[PDB]
Scaffold this active site. Structure first.
Site, PDB file in Angstrom:
ATOM      1  N   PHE B  75       0.804  -1.216   0.000  1.00 56.00           N
ATOM      2  CA  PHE B  75       0.000   0.000   0.000  1.00 56.00           C
ATOM      3  C   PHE B  75       0.838   1.268   0.000  1.00 56.00           C
ATOM      4  O   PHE B  75       0.287   2.350  -0.233  1.00 56.00           O
ATOM      5  CB  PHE B  75      -0.954   0.001   1.194  1.00 56.00           C
ATOM      6  CG  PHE B  75      -2.029  -1.017   1.070  1.00 56.00           C
ATOM      7  CD1 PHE B  75      -2.830  -1.044  -0.055  1.00 56.00           C
ATOM      8  CD2 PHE B  75      -2.191  -1.992   2.032  1.00 56.00           C
ATOM      9  CE1 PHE B  75      -3.802  -2.002  -0.203  1.00 56.00           C
ATOM     10  CE2 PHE B  75      -3.166  -2.952   1.891  1.00 56.00           C
ATOM     11  CZ  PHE B  75      -3.971  -2.960   0.773  1.00 56.00           C
ATOM     12  N   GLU B  76       2.144   1.162   0.265  1.00 58.87           N
ATOM     13  CA  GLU B  76       3.039   2.286   0.017  1.00 58.87           C
ATOM     14  C   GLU B  76       3.195   2.517  -1.482  1.00 58.87           C
ATOM     15  O   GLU B  76       3.168   3.662  -1.953  1.00 58.87           O
ATOM     16  CB  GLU B  76       4.393   2.027   0.686  1.00 58.87           C
ATOM     17  CG  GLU B  76       4.288   1.507   2.129  1.00 58.87           C
ATOM     18  CD  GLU B  76       5.632   1.308   2.840  1.00 58.87           C
ATOM     19  OE1 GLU B  76       6.682   1.796   2.359  1.00 58.87           O
ATOM     20  OE2 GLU B  76       5.633   0.663   3.913  1.00 58.87           O
TER      21      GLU B  76
END
Lengths: 143, 143
Positions: B75-76
């Site tokens: 999700f980064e």
């Protein structure tokens, strides 16, 4: 705050999250749920989308399973736990959907919350009727 | 902005991100890098910090591996791919630390980014030294 409970997830888990929860808690008992796929605008930055709906939600409801705790899904519970230590209007409830062994380097505070938060064991067919022990415990934990 | 590159990750993947990337790009070539553990104050929401350091960064660096793409670290990369859509000041680079299979359930934009982003291969002992092919390509993609 705009939602009674936010519903995070990895019959199936997906069936319990997406069909069963709104059927019972929304369509029969009138609460106001938040599901990522329904209530948020597509595209967008997923990290903020969740921190946003968490900030507008009264409870968090996490359907735990092996696929949850070993996948990217665990991102959602970490944020909830982060935001919960700032505000305790936010009450978190786990749901034991099936056995899961808990992974080995979950971050400190996520391990911590697994150890103390209230769990409602999901028990399959028995739990499905709207008058079940499961939903009873779900409703008890709603605002 | 204020960082040249943000280094995201899930010898070891952590040694690369924490030790070698500062040793070469920061130290040896005078660049300005952002590591989550080093440059953000503790506490705070993990999802508010990755969005903010991404917004402050000229470049995103992502050390891919099965750990990364199958864990929440994915999700980064999803944020940066969306943020980089809005802003053409942000350019993303992929690092292949070791072989992985493209997980079947990544966000649509993440799968797209695996398909088209510049990818530099980590080659073990061969890539460590400063003038290695891996750092040559790295310094090319810096500002």
């Amino acid at each position: 705050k705009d939602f009674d409970a936010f519903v995070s997830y990895a019959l199936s888990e997906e069936h319990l999250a997406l069909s069963l929860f709104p059927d019972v808690l929304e369509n029969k008992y009138g609460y106001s749920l938040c599901l990522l796929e329904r209530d948020v605008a597509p595209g967008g930055v997923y990290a903020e989308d969740i921190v946003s709906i968490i900030k507008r939600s009264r409870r968090g409801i996490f359907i735990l399973s092996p696929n949850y705790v070993n996948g990217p899904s665990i991102f959602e519970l970490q944020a909830a736990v982060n935001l919960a230590l700032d505000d305790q209007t936010l009450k978190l409830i786990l749901i034991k959907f099936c056995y899961f062994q808990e992974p080995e380097s979950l971050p400190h505070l996520v391990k911590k919350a697994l150890r103390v938060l209230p769990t409602v064991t999901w028990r399959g067919l028995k739990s499905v009727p709207p008058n079940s022990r499961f939903w009873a415990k779900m409703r008890y934990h709603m605002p």
